[PDB]
Design a protein around this ligand. Structure first.
Ligand SMILES: N#Cc1ccc(-c2cnc3ccc(NCc4ccccc4)nn23)cc1
Ligand SMILES: [Cl-]
Length: 271
């Protein structure tokens, strides 16, 4: 089966808490004997706090998954740490934090069109990769993207901080979900494409919450009714057309992520 890379606990030097959740705890840390270059490098370390029996089993399958789910625009997974007490995963560190915060902090030094396209294109690139791996994310949103140096952007999936972005039972990011996911919890590459359209809207509104005006009930009604977010002020019409292509009511009518990437990448290269 899949051999997950193991990192010695003693090679991890914890530096600072980045965050906490009901389930996880994330640290910034230095890791020795990892880099091919440097002596030590920065990493992000997630330690599970007193996990269930299923949680343990879940952790191991996720580690095996992440071992090969590897791409320039997917947050880098390095391996698991220690020997289970507790369960620790080690990821690269992305020094500019989550994209939603980043967006809101550069909104009315501002992001120009070329920067917003570069951001969007990188995310679509990661999604092209995910689709090639039959991987359905289910919670694509800028809060789950991270930003590194030079506006490098990568997709993760993080376990609180954005509770408002989920609806009560497990939490669903309804504002990012298409009608068939809300109704049937049918998640596919096509519902991720729908989510990406909303990511585009987030980027071009500097990280505003979709349907901020509406209640969760009203959002369900809204999406089901086939209503869509309006074009953001600084969103070029072709980019909005891409958004609408993501928001086709019938999943098989949606643009595929390869088409979306091809368009956004060209536009970003041209501007
Ligand atoms: N599993 C996992 C995993 C978690 C974080 C990272 C990571 C890597 N660099 C940064 C920088 C900033 C950063 N804030 C987002 C965040 C902070 C606290 C808790 C949850 C999310 N998370 N983060 C990588 C993998
Ligand atoms: Cl330590």
């Amino acid at each position: 089966g899949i051999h997950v890379q193991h990192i010695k606990r003693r090679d991890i030097v914890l530096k600072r808490e980045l965050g906490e959740g009901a389930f996880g705890k994330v640290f910034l840390a230095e890791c020795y004997n990892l880099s091919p270059t440097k002596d030590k490098m920065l990493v992000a370390v997630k330690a599970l706090k007193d996990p269930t029996l299923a949680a343990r089993k879940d952790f191991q399958r996720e580690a095996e998954l992440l071992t090969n789910l590897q791409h320039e625009h997917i947050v880098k997974f390095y391996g698991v740490c220690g020997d289970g007490d507790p369960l620790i995963m080690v990821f690269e560190y992305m020094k500019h934090g989550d994209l939603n915060k980043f967006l809101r902090a550069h909104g009315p030094g501002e992001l120009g069109l070329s920067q917003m396209l570069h951001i969007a294109s990188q995310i679509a690139s990661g999604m092209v990769y995910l689709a090639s791996q039959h991987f359905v994310h289910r919670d694509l949103a800028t809060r789950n993207c991270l930003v590194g140096a030079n506006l490098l952007v990568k997709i993760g999936d993080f376990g609180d901080v954005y509770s408002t972005d989920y609806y009560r039972h497990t939490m669903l990011p309804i504002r990012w979900m298409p009608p068939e996911s809300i109704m049937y919890r049918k998640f596919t590459t096509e519902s991720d494409v729908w989510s990406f359209g909303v990511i585009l809207w987030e980027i071009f509104t500097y990280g505003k919450q979709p349907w901020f005006q509406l209640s969760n009930t009203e959002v369900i009604e809204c999406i089901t009714q086939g209503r869509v977010l309006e074009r953001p002020r600084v969103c070029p019409k072709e980019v909005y057309d891409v958004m609408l292509g993501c928001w086709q009511r019938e999943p098989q009518q949606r643009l595929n992520i390869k088409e979306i990437y091809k368009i956004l990448h060209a536009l970003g290269k041209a501007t």
